[PDB]
């Protein structure tokens, strides 16, 4: 004979009060199973008595990490103090129904007047809490703010991540998406620089013949203004652009003096210098990505970084998909991702598999094993020269 | 939906009161046909599948206005035989199936508590309050309503029961803690005006347990002081205020709230020659606070808010008033 029952869910814990309790001899009967199916014949059994939601996801996380371990929380003790009639079991008891046996023992030890029935032992309270878990969306919907699906989703993620310690040694997404960004904007830098090179050599065609390194081309067409306004070493720029006094600026200016290209307008020069500012901003962002990605690679997988070099190492990581996939692959699959060249390739694949599994399966990895394997590859590079 | 067969019982229950009203000369027969049609439409709306707490409240308001109308008409036609007990019983029935259908609506719970308190039902009010607190334990308004009505009745042990379970539950916001300190010091003022309690150590204990709560900010302790600073006419009020100030000074040393309680400490029970003396003391504290190393914009906003509170009172001198304006304007 049950009086009340606890029921804990991801939004909070609610205790129901049973009226017209379930038949215990005909629990395996088809009419009683159909009654437990239909909400119109199970809501006559249960009536919602109290509800306690969590204050925050931190409290829900503490709630699971206490309840699954077995120990009851202080706010569950609080809500039971509030909802149950205060007795001690000398002349009248209260039967509570709980899902877990350790929680049953602890609630009975905290409240001596409450006899708890566990769902793991008693079939009546098992079927009754099973029906409440069946109809739990509709029994709470008058005070169910939102849904239960996203709450269970986020709470299962928080519980699993707290059990696993996931975020402290999962770090590879920054590396693989940084490789994707680096290649995409390297292509975009080269394409925008080719576009500004053609569309400014239409105006001044000596700059393509006399100046390479298209980033420095974008800088000199940012600083040069028009064809008419040239002077060599005016202020702050060309001395640290390139050689200053006797080598380059004179040649650019005599190229402007003998220059024959089409005269450009002010608004067209404005648009070309806007495109050059765009290209050099993307180049500055490329060097910021390269520095930050070298630092992140030395934080995540330093052995692969020292045996391969960080661009090709992080390319290999991104093509494998993750460090866990890279470590699970053997050395021949890492070959997939004359004779001396293939021999050094197989040896490098073996040592790169060893470096990948060492750098992955550490908590916070090291440097010296990659240093040892790079010394081993260097002494093999010395070894193949004797023959 | 068996709603016709379900509402048949409530109409057949309300019928003999209409028979008594027809056999008296109070409602005529066309008016009683109108009452029958309106109660029938209300019952078939109430017992419908898709219903609402505003629908239950519209039916409650109609039945209660019908009771008031019949009371006016009965006093006008000079009858004393007709009683309001059947109308109160059916209004309690409407409210009970209302809180059965929608237990998660505090507007309907508070309307139920207002009705049960208004027609003199104290024991029923306590039972409804217990059910509402069990369903909404995180509601500081319900907890303060329970505790304040038990203190207004005078059962201070029951008021403490409701308040300590409320402070056991509602620990995210300071609101119920401030209201409990307010109720305990109001009990202290009642114990003083009736002339342990001689020490008055319970708000100091409330502060000492509130020191470790998840709302424990300097703004929350300033809210504690702004609660405590009212009704200073007591015995251990200087003890409580001084303990709050030394707690805030030992914990949050250079906060603008702590400098504000350093400003506004010595004006506890003042209204009168002791008023401008303590005002000059507090203005010395305020000038030291303004020159001292604290976030001056935050402290100045606190002081211009308190100075609006100062300017809200009459009966002062114009030189003091204009120097408050002069010290206000450059903030």
């Amino acid at each position: 004979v049950v009086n009340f029952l606890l029921f804990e869910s991801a939004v909070g814990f609610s205790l129901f009060e049973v009226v017209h309790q379930a038949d215990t001899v005909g629990l395996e009967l088809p009419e009683v199973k159909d009654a437990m199916k239909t909400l119109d014949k199970f809501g006559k059994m249960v009536k919602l008595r109290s509800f306690n939601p969590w204050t925050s996801a931190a409290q829900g996380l503490e709630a699971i990490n206490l309840i699954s371990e077995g120990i009851m929380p202080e706010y569950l003790k609080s809500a039971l103090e509030m909802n149950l009639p205060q007795t001690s079991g000398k002349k009248s008891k209260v039967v509570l129904g709980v899902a877990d046996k350790k929680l049953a023992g602890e609630i009975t030890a905290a409240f001596p007047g409450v006899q708890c029935e566990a769902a793991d032992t008693s079939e009546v309270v098992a079927a009754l809490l099973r029906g409440i878990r069946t109809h739990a969306n509709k029994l709470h919907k008058s005070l169910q703010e939102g849904d239960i699906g996203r709450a269970q989703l986020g709470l299962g993620h928080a519980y699993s991540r707290a059990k696993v310690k996931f975020s402290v040694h999962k770090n590879d997404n920054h590396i693989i998406q940084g490789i994707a960004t680096l290649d995409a904007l390297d292509k975009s830098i080269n394409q925008g620089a080719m576009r500004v090179r053609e569309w400014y050599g239409w105006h001044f065609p000596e700059l393509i013949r006399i100046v390479s390194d298209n980033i420095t081309y974008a800088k000199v067409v940012l600083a040069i203004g028009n064809k008419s306004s040239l002077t060599d070493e005016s202020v702050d720029d060309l001395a640290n652009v390139l050689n200053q006094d006797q080598d380059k600026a004179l040649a650019i200016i005599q190229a402007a003096k003998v220059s024959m290209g089409q005269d450009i307008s002010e608004v067209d020069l404005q648009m070309v210098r806007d495109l050059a500012s765009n290209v050099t901003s993307m180049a500055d962002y490329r060097r910021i990505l390269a520095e930050s990605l070298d630092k992140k690679m030395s934080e995540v997988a330093p052995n692969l970084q020292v045996i391969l070099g960080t661009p090709v190492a992080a390319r290999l990581i991104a093509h494998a998909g993750s460090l866990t996939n890279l470590a699970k692959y053997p050395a021949s699959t890492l070959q997939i991702l004359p004779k001396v060249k293939g021999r050094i390739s197989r040896y490098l694949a073996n040592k790169c598999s060893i470096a990948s599994r060492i750098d992955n399966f550490s908590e916070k990895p090291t440097r010296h094993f990659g240093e040892v394997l790079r010394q081993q590859l260097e002494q093999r590079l010395e070894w193949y020269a004797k023959g | 939906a068996w709603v016709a067969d379900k509402a048949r019982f409530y109409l057949e229950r309300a019928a003999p009161e209409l028979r008594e009203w027809e056999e008296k000369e109070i409602f005529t027969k066309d008016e009683i046909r109108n009452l029958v049609a309106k109660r029938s439409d209300f019952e078939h709306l109430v017992l419908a599948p898709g219903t609402k707490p505003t629908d239950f409240l519209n039916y409650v308001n109609w039945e209660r206005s019908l009771d008031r109308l019949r009371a006016k008409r009965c006093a006008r036609l000079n009858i004393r035989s007709v009683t309001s007990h059947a109308s109160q019983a059916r209004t309690f029935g409407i409210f009970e199936r209302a809180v059965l259908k929608h237990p998660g609506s505090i507007e309907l719970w508070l309307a139920y508590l207002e009705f049960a308190a208004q027609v003199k039902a104290t024991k029923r009010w306590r039972r409804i309050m217990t059910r509402a607190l069990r369903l909404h334990p995180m509601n500081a308004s319900l907890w303060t309503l329970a505790g304040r009505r038990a203190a207004q009745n005078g059962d201070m042990q029951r008021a403490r029961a409701h308040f300590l379970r409320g402070c056991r539950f509602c620990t995210r916001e300071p609101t119920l803690w401030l209201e409990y300190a307010r109720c305990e010091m109001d009990w202290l003022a009642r114990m003083e005006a009736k002339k342990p309690a001689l020490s008055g150590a319970i708000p100091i204990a409330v502060f000492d347990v509130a020191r470790k709560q998840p709302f424990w900010g300097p703004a929350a302790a300033e809210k504690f002081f702004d609660v405590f600073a009212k009704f200073g006419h007591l015995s251990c009020h200087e003890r409580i205020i001084s303990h709050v100030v030394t707690t805030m000074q030992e914990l949050f040393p250079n906060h603008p709230c702590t400098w504000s309680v350093h400003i506004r400490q010595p004006l506890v029970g003042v209204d009168t020659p002791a008023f401008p003396k303590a005002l000059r003391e507090s203005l010395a504290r305020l000038k030291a606070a303004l020159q001292s190393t604290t976030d001056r914009k935050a402290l100045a906003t606190k002081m211009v808010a308190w100075m609006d509170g100062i300017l809200a009172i009459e009966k002062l001198d114009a030189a003091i008033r204009t120097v408050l304006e002069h010290t206000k304007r450059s903030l």
């Binding site: 202080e74 205060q86 | 306590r126 217990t130 342990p196």
Partner: peptide, 28 residues
């Protein structure tokens, strides 16, 4: 009877608040 919320005692006192308040009222 679970009709109302009974006054707390030392048996049904949970937190440090209720322990300290009951200690003060016991010393009263």
């Amino acid at each position: 009877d679970a009709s109302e919320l009974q006054p707390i005692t030392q048996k049904t006192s949970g937190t440090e608040l209720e322990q300290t308040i009951l200690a003060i009222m016991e010393e009263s």
